[PDB]
């Protein structure tokens, strides 16, 4: 009898660990069943896929920068001098069965991971889930976004292809080597010398596969533990009060629903990783400091910085026989953006003056000031994302070769203002639509 | 609260309520999906869920079959097996993702069509503790601090802080003391002593009178022998890429020469763009204060590395005499000493003085009069 075996095993577990009281509390936990509450599940589930696929890739990847001659099955690159990082990346795609499928699933999982964080951040921002007592979880999450920001960038540069290597030279090396007073000290420190060096890829490989995921995993564990014990918020409705949770229990509804949603995320990721080609590194060849390609395909989880580089005017300072290049503005710009994002609830509670306990989610239309600001921030992010595909955009109207950036320069203040006004007016209209 | 006698006669329905009451969960509504067993709709829905789950196994078995028995090896463009190879990875993802996606679909259908619908309310005890745990935990921590008498012993307290601080400062410095390198430590042997890496490049002379050739690349730079050129090798409006090559560098035949040639191509400030403007355009040419006599005839040599972020600007418009950087789209007016005219670039490209030797080969007349590449704090 299976019931006899189940009773015997349950008896053995209870006699040794006595978890019946603890398990029953865990099984009776009630979770709200809103559609927007699955936004954080996709990001968490994508991270697991990244962990599983990243482990597989580590069994065939050599992070060395040592110059070697290609001897694989790719005829166009036969005899071409490259690094061990590029050859093993080629080895995974061609001389390993299923390596290309795993490599593309891993890259697609990263895109879904980064996209889900921003979408899930919008839900927290718009619905006011960052208020007390969930202000510390916003800070923990904000660190996760920053860590996942650099984690994807480091991994994308691991194959050391022509496109990825160019980004390291301009972004990682060019911007860092121009930071006031310590910029060259930070460059000789991370690169261990001058670009390219010989410890770049090995240092990033250790950071990308081990150190950053370890911090992310620890922060995710603290993030999930906080939500589990802080009893996730709910939208106002029939029977919804500030001192109760309305939804379904863990068993057997939420456990099955969450488990089946995990399968769909894995199923969707497997479909895109096999059918849609992402980041073909063999078409570009190994990175060479003397060669840079024109037609590229940068990731959307780290492009807004590139768009800010192009749009910002060439403003430089030369104080007393020194130089402050244009790249300092972009590096400083990321500091304010990250600082403002992390400490939003503290600023929000300082201007609104409310520091009370909140468990019921606030309606986006209720606060048109925040809604419009979030829409303005989302709009500003999108133009900065779309400001670096100017090469294709320029050959669409043909009114001028350089007027494309002037559209960005002028249109990075007018369009966000327009989006702010439209969202603010829409919130008030929706407020009184049913009132 | 109930004794063992009551628990014996309690049924499962009341036991679930009793367990939820302790945890604060109140299941206010529980209803089965099918009120009348035996209807055809329930049987039809059961078959639909089975079809989704069976399709997962059929696709999962296909994944095992296509992984084993299918041409997976890479085939070159224009070959008999190229078409079958191009379908290898798509079939790997089609038979894998669709296998588990259908399983997840069949489980969602099961939970919202066969698992009874429920809505449970759980009382959340948020806020401060009920004033009994707060007082006890505060006393427990205060008793440990007061009982240890650490507050009234300043000699131990100050020593502990200084001792822990000194150990922490030493350990932290020693932990990151091996990742701190002076960027201006003279390491590059030049004509005048040893200079820092940023102040030098492949065009920096190593001794007085050293001859450096504007050598072309036969094939890929660093993998093919470098060949010298003469002025009668670039047509009007043409563009050529040159590297700093010495006669003692060899042609890559030997192992030592191959390493030397690789370092030339590995140089981040080594590439230089050589351009020849048409004779009908020398009138509209503006020189730079210090580089008036750097050009040789109608031949100009500007560094290929962009002054903004270090991208080697490969694009060059012969019609407009403009140099375009492919990274951030910066144009440099080659007529006006390669000064920037649009984009985030703010500094003109460095100009390399050039001339000819006794044999007529193009050579570098000297070193750059300014640092090459992106700017930094200690520049100029």
């Amino acid at each position: 009898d299976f019931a006899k075996l189940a009773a015997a095993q349950g008896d053995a577990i209870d006699s040794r660990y006595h978890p019946s009281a603890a398990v029953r509390r865990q099984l009776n936990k009630v979770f709200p069943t809103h559609w927007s509450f699955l936004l954080g599940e996709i990001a968490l589930y994508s991270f697991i896929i990244l962990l599983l696929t990243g482990v597989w890739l580590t069994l065939f990847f050599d992070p060395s920068m040592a110059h070697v001659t290609y001897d694989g099955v790719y005829q166009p690159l036969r005899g071409v001098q490259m690094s061990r990082a590029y050859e093993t990346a080629l080895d995974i795609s061609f001389e390993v069965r299923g390596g290309l499928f795993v490599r593309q699933v891993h890259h697609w999982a990263a895109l879904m991971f980064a996209a889900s964080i921003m979408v899930h951040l919008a839900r927290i921002f718009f619905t006011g889930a960052f208020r007390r007592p969930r202000e510390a979880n916003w800070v923990i999450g904000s660190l996760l976004l920053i860590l996942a920001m650099f984690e994807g960038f480091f991994g994308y540069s691991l194959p050391d292809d022509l496109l990825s290597g160019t980004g390291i030279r301009a972004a990682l090396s060019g911007i860092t080597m121009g930071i006031p007073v310590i910029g060259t000290w930070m460059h000789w420190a991370l690169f261990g010398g001058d670009f390219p060096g010989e410890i770049l890829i090995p240092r990033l490989y250790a950071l990308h596969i081990l150190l950053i995921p370890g911090i992310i995993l620890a922060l995710i564990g603290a993030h999930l533990a906080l939500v589990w014990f802080q009893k996730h918020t709910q939208f106002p409705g029939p029977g919804r009060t500030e001192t109760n949770v309305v939804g379904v229990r863990v068993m057997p509804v939420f456990a099955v629903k969450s488990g089946a949603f995990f399968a769909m995320i894995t199923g969707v990721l497997g479909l895109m990783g096999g059918l849609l080609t992402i980041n073909p590194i063999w078409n570009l060849g190994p990175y060479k400091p003397s060669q840079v390609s024109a037609g590229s395909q940068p990731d959307f989880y780290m492009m807004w910085t590139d768009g800010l580089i192009r749009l910002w005017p060439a403003w430089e300072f030369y104080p007393f026989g020194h130089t402050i290049p244009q790249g300092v503005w972009v590096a400083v710009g990321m500091g304010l953006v990250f600082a403002l994002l992390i400490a939003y609830p503290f600023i929000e509670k300082k201007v609104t003056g409310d520091d009370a306990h909140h468990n019921l989610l606030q309606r986006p239309r209720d606060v048109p000031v925040r809604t419009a600001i979030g829409s303005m921030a989302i709009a500003l992010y999108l133009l900065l994302t779309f400001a670096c595909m100017n090469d294709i955009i320029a050959l669409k109207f043909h009114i001028s070769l350089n007027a494309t950036t002037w559209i960005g320069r002028i249109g990075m203040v007018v369009l966000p203002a327009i989006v702010y006004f439209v969202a603010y007016r829409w919130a008030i209209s929706l407020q009184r639509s049913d009132r | 609260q109930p004794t063992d006698a009551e628990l014996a006669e309690m049924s499962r329905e009341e036991l679930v309520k009793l367990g939820g009451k302790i945890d604060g969960v109140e299941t206010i509504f529980k209803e089965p999906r099918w009120p009348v067993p035996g209807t055809k709709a329930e049987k039809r829905t059961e078959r639909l869920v089975a079809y989704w789950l069976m399709l997962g196994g059929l696709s999962g078995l296909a994944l095992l079959l296509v992984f084993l028995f299918w041409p997976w090896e890479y085939q070159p463009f224009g070959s008999e097996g190229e078409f079958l190879y191009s379908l290898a990875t798509p079939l790997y993802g089609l038979t894998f993702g669709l296998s588990i996606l259908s399983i997840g679909i069949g489980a969602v259908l099961f939970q919202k069509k066969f698992i009874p619908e429920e809505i449970s309310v759980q009382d959340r005890h948020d806020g401060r503790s009920p004033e009994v745990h707060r007082k006890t935990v505060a006393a427990n921590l205060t008793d440990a601090l007061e009982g240890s008498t650490l507050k009234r012993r300043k000699v131990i307290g100050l020593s502990l802080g200084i001792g822990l601080g000194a150990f922490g400062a030493g350990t932290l410095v020693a932990f990151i003391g091996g990742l701190i390198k002076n960027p201006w430590k003279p390491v590059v042997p030049t004509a005048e002593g040893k200079k820092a890496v940023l102040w030098t490049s492949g065009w920096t002379p190593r001794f007085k009178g050293e001859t450096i050739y504007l050598a072309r690349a036969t094939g890929r730079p660093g993998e093919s022998p470098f060949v010298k050129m003469r002025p009668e090798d670039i047509d009007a409006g043409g563009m050529e890429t040159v590297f700093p090559w010495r006669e003692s560098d060899g042609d890559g035949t030997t192992v030592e020469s191959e390493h030397k040639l690789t370092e030339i191509a590995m140089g981040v400030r080594n590439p230089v763009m050589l351009i020849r403007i048409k004779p009908a355009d020398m009138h509209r040419v503006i020189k730079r204060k210090g580089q008036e006599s750097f050009n040789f005839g109608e031949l100009f040599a500007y560094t290929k590395v962009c002054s903004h972020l270090g991208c080697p600007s490969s694009l060059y418009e012969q019609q407009t005499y403009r140099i375009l950087c492919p990274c951030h789209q910066s144009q440099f007016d080659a007529l006006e000493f390669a000064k920037p005219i649009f984009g985030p670039a703010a500094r003109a490209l460095a100009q390399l003085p050039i001339t000819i030797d006794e044999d007529g080969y193009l050579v570098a007349n000297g070193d750059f009069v300014e640092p090459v590449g992106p700017a930094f704090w200690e520049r100029k």
Partner: peptide, 25 residues
Amino acid sequence: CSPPGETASSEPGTTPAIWTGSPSP
């Protein structure tokens, strides 16, 4: 700001002399 060490010149340029080459080793 404008780079102080970057200004145009109006003085005509002279043809560079031929390179001779002094060998140190």
